[PDB]
């Protein structure tokens, strides 16, 4: 039972800017985290694996970074297809604790 | 990088069994086990562990031992081996560790 | 390619049981784990349990330990999730994913 | 008094009175470390001492009990060696796994191929289990050998239905199978009595390995390797491993096995199952 | 005078004067029936006496010449036995067939499977040919053993093109291959000189069978069974069989072979070719 807090729930940035979303856990996860993207009515989609490396088919605008217990997700720039609810996962220990989630909107 | 290969390049035909030693520089309280296998000539890089185990292998532990020595046996058709180079010269290849 | 095909929606009165099908395609069914994820509308998300089709073992969570039962069939390459004692709070969206490097690669 | 009786093949003597010519119609009467096998080797420095099952070493079939007229093959190097299997990831609710010998190695190596071309099979086995943990991990594993392990069925839970386990559960193959109700071992028998048979305890605070030498046990000297399973292997997490948050949650269980003193007979065509 | 020379490993002695410290720089000097093998047996009552190739019997590799440190397997019963091949229908214009040992048995039996799992190979062979005919049939067959039989190519007939025979002709497999120009044997060498090597004549008026025992001949004690072909087998209808109308026109040619004293080494993965 490792509680991982994702704050805040709602934040808004306009297009062409930069957005930062923080996902923090209770203990050291050894840099094992997976960022997700879920559009309404659809299934989640993987973006970042291991807080650093990318996937195949994902654009290079998504760049994850972090150290210790604080991990961030930087998206530049922002487009109309990148607006969705983002998640973070801890696969270091069982059970796997999913993040609270952050819903993005335009300001 | 080893002095064995450097002095071996002065010579053409070599023979005898070799040895490879691993050293564990990790922490004292970190444990685990490794499988170090040697594939006779003719095999490629094994895809899984069930393929590599078919040859000569050794099991070793981290905690109470700091080193492991894999003795490479002498398996050859000829008493001597010329240096194996690319293409036509792959006939002299010793194996894969 | 790898495709995961679930069943359609279900409607049943409280007190009965329901079985949900998930069928993998284009990949070895018994080689990798098969997970399950519940999403409670709309803000809740958490992990349920996994199953390894080769052996058939099941790894559950603390809350879903007694409620859900996971089975698998190697012949049809299909995973099953059986729910018992259905209540009003047990109605949510269920996911079927696989584990590779410890994350969920395909949903 | 001809010797037809059942007790006349043992080394113990009994006194009995018999009024007929057959001795079976008579009465009862007074009663009176580093292991290198073949091309493979292992060194276990954390392991407890080797437990010999029933205090007997595997050996070749003597000519006294051998009923076969064929001269058997003894491929010492290509048959008897350490065979490493897949690793089983441990979890807190893990119920344990079981393998059926000698059905695991039928698809692997020279041992598996010659087993398909030969009708008669006799060999001894070497059981070895590997589970690694650190000083912050507390757990216990029970590795036991039960000869003639028969799988039962819950019969739907009611008991009025007649059903038998399929070939997938009775013959798990190399990957193995998982227990359903470890308390009865799906034999309907208690788990607390499993230690009557040869067993070894794996305690993560002391011994992370186990070694058990099981010889050939059957009512017949040679037997078909494909149909008949000699004994099963049970790795049961009696004490669930406990670890706090931040520790490594992936604990593998590695099981490597080797045959000892294998003899094959009845060279025939290719037979899978 | 150190002994570095090439002639100092034989049993013959030579006298030579040398003005240096190396003996290879010196001068020349004065110069000075029923066969039961394994699980299979054969009885040949019409056959001529067995012809031993080069007057030596197949035997195990001695430790003097053995350069391998591994301990080899000797599956006596599952390896060495009579292997019967497909029959070749004879015709008047038939040019003859040839097989490449030990490439024929690579797909057959335990011998073929262990050959794929072992890098080093040494064994002796037993060649047997069967051609049946009646008293009204007149013909002659030449069964010879030529070590290191290399296939040539006509080079398109002009001679200015460089071409090599493919793997299908150089490695015919179990079925074998047919000769193109039997006069040169596709080696560019005369057929009349083929009897210099071990040979046996099959004359349908006397002997309908042939037996030739060929030991292991190579510059190396062990060698790869897949790539290197030791010797070929030639069944050449020198004298065309003649028969009048009404006689049976189907004359089969049966070739059965067996290994002798096989030793395998270098247990490895599965390697087809």
The answer to whether the CB of D266 falls within 8 A of the CB of D120 is yes
DSSP D160-217: -S-----HHHH---SS-EE-S-TTTTTTTS-STTGGGSSEEEEETTT--EEEEEE---
Q: What is the CATH number of the domain that holds C46?
A: 2.60.40.10
E115 interaction partners in chain B (CB closer than 8 Å): none
C9 touches chain A (CB under 8 A): no
Per-residue CA distances from A96 to C32, C103, D133, E248 (Å): 17, 10, 21, 82
Q: Do E222 and B73 touch (CB under 8 A)?
A: no
The answer to whether the CB of D215 falls within 8 A of the CB of D53 is yes
ω into residue E16 within 30 of 0, thus cis? Answer: no
D222 touches chain B (CB under 8 A): no
**DSSP-based three-state secondary structure for D241:** strand
The answer to whether the CB of C58 falls within 8 A of the CB of C51 is yes
Burial of residue A66 (number of CB atoms within 10 Å: 0-12, 13-18, 19+): middle
Left if phi > 0, otherwise alpha if psi is -120 to 50, otherwise beta: which for A16?
Answer: left
The answer to whether the CB of C78 falls within 8 A of the CB of C23 is yes
Alpha carbon distance B17, B30 (integer Å): 33
Least Cα distance to D71 among D265, D267, D223 occurs for D265
Who's near E9: CB < 8 A, 6+ residues apart? none
End-to-end CA distance of chain A: 37
In what helix (H) or strand (E) does residue B37 lie, and over which residues does it extend? Answer: strand B33-38
Domains of chain E, residue spans: 23-267
End-to-end CA distance of chain E: 48
Burial of residue D55 (number of CB atoms within 10 Å: 0-12, 13-18, 19+): exposed
Q: Nearest CA of chain A to the CA of C47: how many Å? A: 6
D108 touches chain E (CB under 8 A): no
E77 interaction partners in chain D (CB closer than 8 Å): 70-73, 267
Alpha carbon distance E195, E201 (integer Å): 10
Interface probe with D: pick from C34, C53, C54, most Cβ of D within 10 Å: C54
Q: Nearest CA of chain A to the CA of C74: how many Å? A: 25
DSSP for residue E73: B
Least Cα distance to B32 among C42, C86, D130, E2 occurs for D130
Alpha carbon distance E63, D215 (integer Å): 34
Strands (E) across chain D are located at: 34-37, 40-43, 51-52, 83-87, 97-100, 118-131, 138-147, 177-178, 199-203, 209-214, 231-242, 253-267
What is the DSSP pairing of strand D253-267 with strand C3-6?
Answer: unpaired
Alpha carbon distance D143, D238 (integer Å): 10
Who's near C19: CB < 8 A, 6+ residues apart? C80, C81, C82, C83
Helices E109-117 & D109-117, crossing angle to 10 degrees?
Answer: 180
Alpha carbon distance A68, D131 (integer Å): 30
A97 interaction partners in chain C (CB closer than 8 Å): 46-47
In what helix (H) or strand (E) does residue E127 lie, and over which residues does it extend? Answer: strand E118-131
Give all strands of the β-sheet with D97-100 in edge-to-edge order. D177-178, D97-100, D231-242, D138-147, D199-203
Alpha carbon distance E237, E249 (integer Å): 15
DSSP for residue E49: P
Q: Do B75 and E70 touch (CB under 8 A)?
A: yes
DSSP for residue D76: H
ω into residue E238 within 30 of 0, thus cis? Answer: no
E273 touches chain B (CB under 8 A): no
- In total, the C-beta contacts within 8 angstroms joining chain A to chain D are 15
Alpha carbon distance C37, C61 (integer Å): 11
D71 interaction partners in chain E (CB closer than 8 Å): 76-77
D177 interaction partners in chain C (CB closer than 8 Å): 55-56
The answer to whether the CB of E188 falls within 8 A of the CB of E159 is no
**What is the dihedral angle through the alpha carbons of D202, D203, D206, D211, rounded to the nearest 10 degrees?**
0
Per-residue CA distances from D60 to D9, D73, D104 (Å): 21, 11, 22
End-to-end CA distance of chain B: 16
Give the 3-state secondary structure percentages of chain D, helix then strand then coil, rounded to 5: 10, 35, 55
Per-residue CA distances from C57 to C60, D97, D108, D227 (Å): 10, 9, 24, 25
CA angle C9, C14, C16 (to 5 degrees): 80
* Number of domains within chain C: 1
DSSP E172-222: --SS-EE-S-TTTTTTTS-STTGGGSSEEEEETTT--EEEEEE----SSSS
Interface probe with E: pick from B76, B82, B95, most Cβ of E within 10 Å: B76
End-to-end CA distance of chain C: 13
Q: Do E118 and D78 touch (CB under 8 A)?
A: yes
Q: Which chains sit next to E, with 3 or more Cβ pairs under 8 A? A: B, D
The answer to whether the CB of D71 falls within 8 A of the CB of D215 is no
CA angle D4, D5, D7 (to 5 degrees): 145
DSSP for residue B12: S
Name the experimental technique. cryo-EM
The answer to whether the CB of D42 falls within 8 A of the CB of D256 is yes
Give chain A's count of helices (H) and strands (E): 0, 10
The answer to whether the CB of E90 falls within 8 A of the CB of E238 is no
Alpha carbon distance B15, B11 (integer Å): 11
Alpha carbon distance D238, D201 (integer Å): 10
Cα diameter, chain C:
39
The answer to whether the CB of E113 falls within 8 A of the CB of E191 is no
ω into residue A95 within 30 of 0, thus cis? Answer: yes
**DSSP-based three-state secondary structure for D124:** strand
Count of CB atoms within 10 A of residue D265's CB?
Answer: 22
Q: Nearest CA of chain D to the CA of A68: how many Å? A: 13
The answer to whether the CB of E218 falls within 8 A of the CB of E148 is no
Alpha carbon distance D2, A31 (integer Å): 82
**DSSP-based three-state secondary structure for A23:** strand
The answer to whether the CB of E73 falls within 8 A of the CB of D38 is no
The answer to whether the CB of E114 falls within 8 A of the CB of E218 is no
Q: Which of D73, D109, D118 sits opposite E76 (nearest CB)?
A: D73
- In sequence order, what are the beta bridge partners of D200? D143
Q: Which chains sit next to D, with 3 or more Cβ pairs under 8 A? A: A, B, C, E
- In sequence order, what are the beta bridge partners of D43? D34
**DSSP-based three-state secondary structure for A5:** strand
Instruction: List residues in chain E that are followed by a break over 2.5 Å (C to N).
Output: 32
Who's near C57: CB < 8 A, 6+ residues apart? C51, D91, D94, D95, D97, D178
Instruction: List residues in chain D that are followed by a break over 2.5 Å (C to N).
Output: 32
Alpha carbon distance A48, E194 (integer Å): 73
Reported structure resolution in angstroms: 2.9
What are the φ/ψ torsions at residue D113 (nearest 5 degrees)?
Answer: -75, -45
Burial of residue A2 (number of CB atoms within 10 Å: 0-12, 13-18, 19+): middle
* CATH class of the domain comprising A4-105: mainly beta
Alpha carbon distance D38, E170 (integer Å): 37
Alpha carbon distance D231, D53 (integer Å): 12
- Cα dihedral across residues C26, C32, C34, C39: positive or negative: negative
Who's near E4: CB < 8 A, 6+ residues apart? E22, E23, E24
DSSP for residue D71: P
For chains A and D, having 3+ Cβ pairs within 8 Å is answered yes
Q: Do B33 and D42 touch (CB under 8 A)?
A: no
Q: Which residues of C sit within 8 Å Cβ distance of D?
A: 30, 54-60, 65, 74
Per-residue CA distances from E120 to B3, B41, E79, E113, E235 (Å): 30, 10, 15, 13, 29
The answer to whether the CB of D185 falls within 8 A of the CB of D179 is yes
Q: Which of C46, C59, C102 sits opposite A98 (nearest CB)?
A: C46
ω into residue C61 within 30 of 0, thus cis? Answer: no
ω into residue D72 within 30 of 0, thus cis? Answer: no
The answer to whether the CB of E174 falls within 8 A of the CB of E85 is yes
Q: Do D93 and C59 touch (CB under 8 A)?
A: yes
Give chain B's count of helices (H) and strands (E): 2, 4
Least Cα distance to B14 among B73, B96, B92, B97 occurs for B92
DSSP A29-65: -TT--EEEEE-TTS--EEEEETTTB--SS--TTEEEE
Alpha carbon distance D254, D84 (integer Å): 8
What is the DSSP pairing of strand D97-100 with strand D231-242?
Answer: antiparallel
Give all strands of the β-sheet with E209-214 in edge-to-edge order. E51-52, E209-214, E118-131, E253-267, E83-87
Alpha carbon distance D18, D1 (integer Å): 9
- Cα dihedral across residues A56, A59, A62, A67: positive or negative: positive
Who's near D66: CB < 8 A, 6+ residues apart? D221, D222
**DSSP-based three-state secondary structure for D120:** strand
Length of chain E: 273
Alpha carbon distance E120, C104 (integer Å): 46
CATH topology classification for D23-267: Jelly Rolls (2.60.120)
D78 touches chain B (CB under 8 A): no
Range of the domain at C49: 3-107
Least Cα distance to D140 among D243, D239, D244 occurs for D239
- Cα dihedral across residues D125, D104, D165, D96: positive or negative: positive
The answer to whether the CB of A47 falls within 8 A of the CB of A55 is yes
Q: Which of A1, A9, A101 sits opposite C45 (nearest CB)?
A: A101
Alpha carbon distance D230, D227 (integer Å): 10
**What is the dihedral angle through the alpha carbons of C87, C90, C94, C98, rounded to the nearest 10 degrees?**
-100
Cα diameter, chain B:
49
Alpha carbon distance E205, B28 (integer Å): 85
D130 touches chain B (CB under 8 A): yes
């Amino acid at each position: 039972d490792i509680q991982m807090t994702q704050s805040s729930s709602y934040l808004s940035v306009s297009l062409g800017g930069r957005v930062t979303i923080t996902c923090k856990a209770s203990d050291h996860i050894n840099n094992w985290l997976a960022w997700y993207q879920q559009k309404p009515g659809n299934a989640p989609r993987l973006l970042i694996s291991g807080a650093t490396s990318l996937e195949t088919g994902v654009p290079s605008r998504f760049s994850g970074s972090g150290s210790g217990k604080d991990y961030t997700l930087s998206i530049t720039s922002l487009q109309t297809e990148d607006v969705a609810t983002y998640y973070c996962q801890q696969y270091w220990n069982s059970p796997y604790t999913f993040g609270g989630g952050t819903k993005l909107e335009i300001k | 990088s080893t002095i064995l290969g450097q002095l071996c390049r002065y010579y053409t035909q070599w023979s005898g069994s070799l040895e490879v030693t691993f050293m564990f520089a990790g922490s004292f309280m970190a444990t685990g086990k490794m499988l170090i296998a040697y594939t006779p000539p003719g095999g490629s890089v094994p895809a899984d562990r069930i393929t590599a185990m078919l040859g000569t292998h050794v099991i070793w532990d981290f905690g109470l031992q700091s080193s492991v020595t894999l003795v490479v046996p002498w398996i050859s058709n000829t008493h001597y081996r010329a240096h194996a180079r690319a293409g036509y010269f792959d006939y002299y290849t010793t194996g894969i560790i | 390619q790898v495709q995961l095909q679930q069943s359609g929606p279900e409607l049943v009165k409280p007190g009965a049981s329901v079985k949900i099908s998930c069928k993998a395609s284009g990949y070895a069914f018994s080689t990798s784990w098969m997970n399950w994820v519940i999403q409670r509308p709309g803000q809740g998300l958490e992990w349920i349990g996994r199953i390894y089709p080769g052996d058939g073992d099941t790894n559950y969570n603390g809350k879903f330990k007694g409620k859900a039962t996971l089975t698998a069939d190697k012949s049809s390459s299909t995973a099953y999730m059986q729910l018992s004692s259905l209540t009003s709070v047990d109605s949510a969206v269920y996911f079927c994913a696989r584990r590779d490097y410890g994350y969920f690669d395909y949903w | 008094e001809n010797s037809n009786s059942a007790s006349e093949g043992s080394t113990i003597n009994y006194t009995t009175i018999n009024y007929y010519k057959d001795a079976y119609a008579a009465s009862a009467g007074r009663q009176d470390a580093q292991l290198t096998i073949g091309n493979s080797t292992i060194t276990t420095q954390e392991a407890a001492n080797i437990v010999i099952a029933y205090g007997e070493w595997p050996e070749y079939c003597p000519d006294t009990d051998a009923t076969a007229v064929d001269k058997p093959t003894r491929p010492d190097v290509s048959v008897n060696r350490f065979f490493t299997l897949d690793t089983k990831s441990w979890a807190k609710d893990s119920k344990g796994w079981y393998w059926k010998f000698p059905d695991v190695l039928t698809e692997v190596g020279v041992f598996g191929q010659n087993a398909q071309f030969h009708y008669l099979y006799r060999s001894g086995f070497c059981v070895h289990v590997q589970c690694n943990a650190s000083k912050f991990h507390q757990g216990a594993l029970l590795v036991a050998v039960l000869p003639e392990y028969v799988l039962g069925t819950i019969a739907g839970g009611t008991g009025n239905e007649n059903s038998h386990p399929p070939y997938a559960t009775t013959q798990p193959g190399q990957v193995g199978a998982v227990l359903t109700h470890p308390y009865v071992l799906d034999a309907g028998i208690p788990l607390s009595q499993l230690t009557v048979c040869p067993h070894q305890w794996i305690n993560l605070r002391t011994n992370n390995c186990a070694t058990i030498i099981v010889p050939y046990m059957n009512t017949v000297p040679f037997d078909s390797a494909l149909n008949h399973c000699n004994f099963g292997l049970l790795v049961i997490p009696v004490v669930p491993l406990d670890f706090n948050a931040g520790a490594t949650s992936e604990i593998p269980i590695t099981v490597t096995i080797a045959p000892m003193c294998a003899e094959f007979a009845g060279l025939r065509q290719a037979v899978k199952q």
